[PDB]
């Protein structure tokens, strides 16, 4: 037995009798150079076989005649194989490649003969940000040390003072947040709407449920502000003068813009 | 000079693809862009290449751009085939092909349109169309350019279909003769590609609230096939073209004909290249939003009382009930639906389902809700059907085939679904809901078709007690006529009174005469129905 | 390829002298059983070509049908060199083909493969019958130039007929159900079947083609003139109505060998719940199956559970079904709401716009073979529950309807969840009355699986410590190491056997095992079935019938299958009779409590 059921060479050697043809026929059939991912060819060549076969068998191929192929595995991390002929086959070629492949099979036979058809090793290539949480606030009414007089009233004397400042303060962050909408709005109209009498109301509800559906919504009455701040920062092009209800805009003629965009 | 036109458009568009679109290095991706799309391109098997529409505006000034947008389907051919010039030389791909197909699809495009703003001006134009899919049609393999076969000379000829009618050349070019008998087809040598077709309809928002919403059919070719879902909201991007339909007869009349031959008559129809549709991801959300909204969101996330700034501020009209409109600001706050392990799955959202006395403004917060609420639908129920509430069947004539209609509660995924007056529904359509509740996936096999569809839709209701108003005198359980399963689903309960006092129904009158006196719109909440909009859209994405 | 000629000279040097081992030519066998058997249909063993001429098999992506029509006129031509009778037997012969390796699913196909060779699995989801298809308009009816007395715009009409038929059966072919990702409809894909192949195959049951992919349009326009209706059709040549490593089934067996196989599979059968063993154990046991049976003699009886969950609300059974469909093999998920009997049975129809007759297998069909899950019973018409009532008894659907005549097959088990009317149990009254479905149906099932929530101060405590605990597991190459193997850490949290081995269990089992019994028992257990008579007849109205007994083996089986025994044996056959002696007894009303002792005889 530990003499000859090592001569089990038939059941590995047929292996590579089909495996290049499956390999060629992919190779046949796909113009993207073949990659082969073993998850796919591995069962196609199981089922040529209908025996169980896993990358090991590969791996003995690679141990009896290891120069037949490249064996390197992907970026992905997955072990890939393909052919080293430079055009599709010529079928003598790979006839006279299965023979000297059982011939390589019968040196090794003899040289052998313990060993039980081994596998070689693989060549193996060498290889905080506003996230505006508040975990921590929420924890109990920790808030008992300080045990103060009357003075937080002084506290609230200036609370007051701010309360000016605040409000303001609240409200230039309006003068900074429609800035940045409107950073994209003088390419929103000008780049698909060259219509020339558009009105204020129709432009207004094309902006909401524009990209404004998207991340970063937006209000209507917040749309008309965009409009009226693009005029005012651009009289030039920009006219805009009402009838009776709803302001008429301007006719376009697309300048270049964040050369004014720069005034916030 | 229009030839040159398009040259000058093929010049330009092969050297902005050419040079780097994209600035960054060393902190986003390489300075050359689309080169790289192309390596990523020709190792895989994609065969179309997008490329994002801002960058061709910050190409030549928009100009490129601009008349890219205005005037498309001229250069559609145009420019694919200036594609080639460039991607012969760096990527060999073509020639290994053997196949000289790209789809250049376009996206983020500036400005959406609703479907009614569609004209017959933007004939031939490119444009983006946001709504919601429906009665998707099956693929179908459609010729692209075709191979006919001469009668006597039996040579080749590359021939090129419109999607109009069978074309055909007239003489052979075969220069051996120059018959015009019919030359046979090949299919074989005819590069096919196939298309699916789905009915778009308007959403919600857009529609003013009391109008039926106008529809469309668009078209998906190239591989943008199968990526729409009945009732998923995408926002399509491509040319709007028009296709002749014989079958349009009578009642418009006037219409001409071809004599100095046959009726041409013709129907809008958008053909779609790109479909998207979306809708710890706050490391996307965030670094998307601009540095200048950031400031924004912080101020109304690190004020300590916006729990309760925004939960008194959700019915601004509505006169307190601080138990429901909390009930409701939740609901707009899903849960996690995060699966199990890779056993089962299991629900993340969220059913609050009002029960009230009469005149307790339990329908205000619905027809608010459905208005505020993004993706919503707001539904009678008794009006309605079972079938028409979870999906419908219905039959097809493009192929002869039975189909899905998305339905209230498919295209209401991802959004709050109210309904009315569950009482007066008959169990008949009481029933077609449950798997929407806690299997969240819709399961239907009728007509041959067997699928299912998942509704990860949260869901509401106003229904009102057994007696119209229920007696206090009598218990809770023989009070609200509704079985043990649907009445455990629903993972709120708000069985809401209406009873008497003096400083309370005073205070009551005062706001409701106030809300009359329009001059005394002192409504105005902390938070205005907007912000809170942008606020949600934020805190969507904490899975704590 | 014009010079073919030669290369078909070349591909005939394989066509009869070829031998192996010992002789035996594959095709001196096959011509010979032609001559005897008059088929008309040539085999190909892909297997032994592709040893023989690497071009020829390579052959097969070019021009692969004309390769194939030039070879099977001169296999014809060789049959008829060693019978000359046989060209004058049939009119032509076309060869079929073994097998690829080329395991394309249904969700993979591309403009690639189209027109080449695809070998691809799923299920017939529904068939036509034989058309004369069409196939100087010679099959065009599209193409007219001026072949018309008043051409211009006066019509000419040709007729349908006088022209060449071809046996011609459209089948639709769908994904196999279950390994469709939810959501997503499945594919359909027209395969065409031609005269060998003509009704070889059935809707329900799992095939194989390993026809080209052709790119093919159908004549009804019904779109525009110059248009036909072009669909990616399958042409059939050869179809198969129908493995893993060797130490997989070793170490699988090393685990199967312990003693607690059969309660560690039931703590790992569902995932994610608390409580419910008796529940777990009748899921992993009609889940498992048990070896059929049929019987000429009086009636095929089959050995397929059937377990109706006997639900109530807040007790996870649903999710227990849902596992079901992930885990199982043909699971048919469908609900009591679109239930349209037409539906979950198999129907037959005329198509409006091909005026075609088709029959449409139905859930039961679409199911065959595995195990169909419904839910809501007693929310669906009672027609349905007729039609359902109809398949179980049979376990099959026949059908002999208007212009149609056959009899599908639909062994598949049925789980079925419930909801008691009205509300929840009303007390220990009886299951009949606790329910509206009818006691022929009733009967048909074999298990109950009666679940019952009640209020408790500490098992509820326990139980929400373990849905918390769910709900908080639930939420490069070496990120998805550590990721794989932290999802396996999970899956060891839920200490039993991990799941993918769980469902190459099920796999392994319902292939391989068959178990059955020995004489000894069976007469004691028959006893035993005499002594539950007795303690029925004193509880008055019962349905005790040979059902109940059969239930019992058709249990043991599948409980041996869990132990891989091939024979029952005790323990597994005590475990059996106590499932279904306590399943009824929660059936029953107050007399359960002396029930406990009254059929306590058992245990
Ligand atoms: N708490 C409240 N504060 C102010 N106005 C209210 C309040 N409740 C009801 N109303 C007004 O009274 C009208 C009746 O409201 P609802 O009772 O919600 O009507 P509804 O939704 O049709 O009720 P049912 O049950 O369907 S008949 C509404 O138009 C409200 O404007
Ligand atoms: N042991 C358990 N562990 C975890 N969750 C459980 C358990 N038992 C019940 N559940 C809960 O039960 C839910 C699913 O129960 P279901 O079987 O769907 O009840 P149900 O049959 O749908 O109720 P119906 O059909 O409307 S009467 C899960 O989402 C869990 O929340």
């Known amino acids: 037995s530990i003499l000859r059921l090592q001569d089990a060479m038939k059941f590995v050697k047929e292996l590579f009798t089909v495996c290049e043809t499956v390999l060629s026929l992919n190779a046949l059939s796909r113009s993207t150079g073949v990659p082969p991912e073993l998850h796919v060819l591995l069962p196609q060549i199981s089922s040529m076989m209908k025996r169980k076969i896993v990358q090991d068998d590969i791996l003995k191929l690679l141990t009896i005649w290891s120069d037949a192929y490249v064996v390197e595995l992907n970026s992905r991390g997955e072990l890939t194989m393909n052919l080293p002929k430079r055009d599709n086959l010529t079928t003598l070629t790979n006839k006279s490649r299965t023979l000297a492949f059982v011939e390589r099979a019968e040196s090794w036979y003899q040289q052998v003969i313990s060993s039980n058809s081994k596998t070689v090793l693989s060549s193996k290539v060498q290889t905080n940000s506003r996230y505006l949480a508040n975990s921590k606030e929420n924890f109990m009414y920790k808030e008992k040390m300080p045990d103060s007089q009357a003075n937080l009233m002084d506290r609230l004397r200036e609370r007051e003072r701010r309360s000016a400042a605040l409000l303001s303060q609240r409200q230039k962050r309006y003068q900074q947040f429609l800035a940045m909408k409107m950073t994209q709005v003088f390419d929103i109209l000008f780049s698909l709407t060259r219509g020339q009498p558009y009105t204020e109301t129709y432009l207004s509800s094309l902006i909401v449920d524009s990209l404004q559906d998207s991340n970063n919504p937006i209000g209507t009455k917040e749309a008309s502000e965009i409009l009226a701040g693009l005029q005012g920062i651009l009289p030039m092009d920009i006219s805009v003068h009402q009838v009776d209800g709803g302001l008429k805009v301007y006719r376009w003629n697309s300048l270049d813009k964040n050369r004014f965009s720069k005034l916030l | ?544 | 390829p014009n010079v073919s000629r030669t290369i078909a000279r070349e591909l005939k040097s394989f066509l009869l002298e070829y031998t192996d081992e010992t002789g035996r030519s594959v095709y001196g066998a096959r011509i010979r059983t032609l001559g005897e058997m008059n088929s008309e249909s040539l085999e190909v063993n892909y297997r032994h070509l592709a040893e023989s001429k690497a071009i020829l098999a390579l052959f097969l992506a070019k021009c692969p049908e004309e390769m194939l029509k030039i070879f099977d006129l001169v296999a014809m031509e060789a049959t008829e060199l060693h019978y000359p009778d046989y060209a004058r037997i049939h009119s032509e012969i076309h060869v079929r083909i073994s097998d690829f390796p080329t395991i394309y699913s249904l969700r993979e196909l591309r403009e690639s493969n189209l027109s080449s060779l695809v070998r691809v699995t799923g299920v017939v989801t529904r068939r036509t019958g034989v058309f004369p298809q069409l196939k100087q308009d010679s099959n065009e009816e599209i193409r007219i130039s001026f072949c018309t007395n008043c051409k211009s715009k006066g019509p000419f009409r040709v007729n349908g007929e006088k022209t060449v038929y071809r046996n011609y059966q459209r089948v639709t072919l769908q994904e196999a159900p279950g390994t469709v990702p939810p959501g997503r409809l499945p594919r359909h894909r027209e395969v065409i079947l031609l005269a060998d192949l003509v009704d070889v195959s059935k809707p329900g049951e799992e095939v194989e083609v390993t026809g080209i992919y052709k790119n093919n349009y159908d004549g009804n326009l019904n779109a525009k003139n110059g248009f036909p209706v072009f669909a990616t059709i399958i042409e059939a040549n050869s179809i198969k109505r129908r493995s893993w490593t060797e130490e997989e089934e070793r170490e699988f067996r090393k685990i199967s060998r312990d003693r607690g196989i059969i309660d560690k599979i039931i703590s790992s059968m569902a995932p994610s719940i608390y409580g419910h063993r008796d529940i777990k154990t009748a899921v992993a046991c009609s889940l498992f199956g048990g070896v059929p049976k049929n019987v000429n003699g009086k009636h095929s009886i089959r050995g397929d559970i059937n377990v109706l969950l006997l639900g109530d609300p807040g007790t996870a059974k649903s999710q227990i079904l849902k596992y079901v469909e992930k885990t199982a093999h043909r699971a048919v998920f469908a609900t009591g709401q679109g239930a349209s009997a037409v539906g979950l049975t198999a129907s037959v129809r005329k198509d409006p716009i091909t005026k075609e007759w088709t029959l449409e297998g139905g859930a039961l069909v679409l199911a065959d073979k595995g195990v169909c899950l419904i839910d809501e019973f007693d929310k669906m018409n009672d027609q349905d529950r007729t039609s359902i009532h109809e398949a179980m008894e049979q376990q099959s659907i026949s059908i002999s309807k208007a212009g149609i005549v056959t009899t599908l097959q639909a062994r598949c088990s049925i789980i079925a969840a419930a909801n008691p009317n009205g509300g929840r149990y009303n007390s220990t009254l009886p299951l009949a009355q606790n329910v509206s479905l009818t006691e022929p149906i009733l009967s048909r099932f074999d298990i109950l699986c009666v679940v019952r929530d009640l209020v408790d101060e500490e098992a509820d405590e326990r139980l929400a410590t373990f849905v918390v605990d769910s709900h908080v597991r639930s939420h490069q190459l070496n990120a998805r190491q550590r990721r794989l193997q932290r999802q396996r850490k999970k899956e060891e949290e839920i200490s039993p056997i991990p799941q993918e081995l769980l469902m190459k269990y099920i796999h392994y089992a319902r292939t391989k095992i068959y178990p059955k019994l020995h004489q000894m028992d069976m007469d004691k257990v028959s006893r035993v079935y005499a002594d539950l008579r007795r303690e029925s007849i004193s509880t008055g109205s019962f349905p005790i019938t040979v059902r109940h007994l059969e239930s019992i083996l058709r249990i043991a089986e599948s409980f041996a299958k869990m132990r891989l025994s091939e024979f029952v044996s005790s323990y597994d056959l005590d475990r059996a009779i106590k499932v279904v002696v306590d399943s009824f007894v929660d059936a029953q009303k107050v007399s359960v409590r002396r029930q406990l002792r009254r059929s306590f005889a058992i245990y």
């Open chain 2, 1 to 544: 000079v229009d030839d040159v036109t398009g040259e000058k458009v093929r010049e330009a568009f092969e050297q902005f693809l050419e040079d780097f679109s994209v600035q960054s290095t060393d902190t986003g991706e390489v300075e050359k862009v689309y080169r790289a799309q192309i390596e990523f391109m020709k190792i895989y098997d994609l065969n179309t290449i997008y490329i994002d529409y801002q960058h061709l505006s910050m190409r030549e000034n928009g100009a490129l751009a601009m008349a890219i947008s205005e005037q498309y389907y001229r250069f559609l051919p145009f420019l694919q085939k200036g594609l080639r010039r460039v991607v012969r030389k760096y990527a060999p791909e073509l020639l290994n092909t053997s196949e000289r197909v790209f789809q250049i699809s376009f996206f983020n495009l500036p400005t959406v349109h609703r479907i009614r703003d569609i004209r017959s001006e933007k004939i031939g134009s490119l444009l983006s169309i946001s709504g919601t899919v429906t009665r998707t049609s099956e693929v179908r393999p459609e010729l692209y350019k075709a191979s006919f076969t001469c009668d006597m000379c039996r040579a080749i000829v590359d021939n090129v279909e419109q999607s109009f009618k069978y074309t055909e050349p007239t003489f052979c070019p075969n220069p051996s003769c120059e018959n015009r008998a019919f030359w046979t087809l090949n299919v074989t040598r005819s590069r096919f590609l196939d298309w699916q077709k789905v009915r778009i309809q308007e959403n919600a928002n857009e529609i003013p609230t009391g109008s039926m919403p106008r529809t469309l059919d668009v078209i998906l070719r190239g591989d943008s096939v199968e990526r729409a879902k009945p009732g998923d909201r995408c926002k399509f991007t491509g040319v709007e073209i028009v296709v002749p339909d014989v079958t349009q007869l009578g009642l418009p009349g006037v219409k001409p004909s071809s004599t100095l031959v046959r009726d041409l008559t013709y129907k809008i129809s958008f053909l779609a290249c790109h479909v998207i549709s979306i809708g710890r991801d706050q490391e996307v959300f965030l670094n998307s939003l601009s540095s200048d909204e950031i400031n924004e969101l912080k101020e109304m996330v690190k004020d300590e009382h916006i729990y309760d700034k925004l939960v008194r501020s959700i019915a601004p009209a509505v006169f307190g009930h601080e138990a429901v409109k909390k009930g409701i600001l939740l609901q707009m706050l899903g849960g996690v639906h995060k699966s199990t392990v890779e056993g089962i799955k299991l629900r993340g959202d969220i059913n609050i389902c009002v029960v009230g006395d009469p005149s307790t403004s339990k329908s205000q917060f619905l027809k608010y809700v459905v208005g505020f609420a993004p993706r919503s639908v707001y539904t009678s129920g008794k009006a309605s059907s079972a079938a028409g509430l979870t999906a419908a069947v219905v039959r097809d004539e493009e192929g002869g085939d039975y189909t899905i209609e998305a339905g209230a509660l498919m295209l209401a995924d991802n959004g709050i679904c109210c309904i009315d007056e569950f009482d007066k529904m008959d169990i008949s359509d009481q029933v077609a809901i449950h798997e929407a509740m806690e299997q969240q996936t819709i399961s239907i096999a009728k007509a041959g078709i067997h699928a299912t569809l998942n509704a990860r839709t949260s869901i509401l209701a106003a229904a009102n007690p057994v007696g119209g108003r229920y007696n206090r005198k009598l218990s809770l359980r023989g009070n609200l006529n509704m079985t043990a399963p649907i009445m455990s689903r629903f993972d709120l309960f708000f069985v809401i009174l209406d009873d008497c006092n003096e400083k309370i129904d005073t205070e009551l009158a005062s706001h409701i005469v106030d809300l009359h006196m329009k001059r005394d719109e002192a409504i105005e909440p902390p938070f205005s129905a907007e912000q809170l909009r942008r606020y949600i859209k934020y805190a969507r994405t904490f899975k704590p």
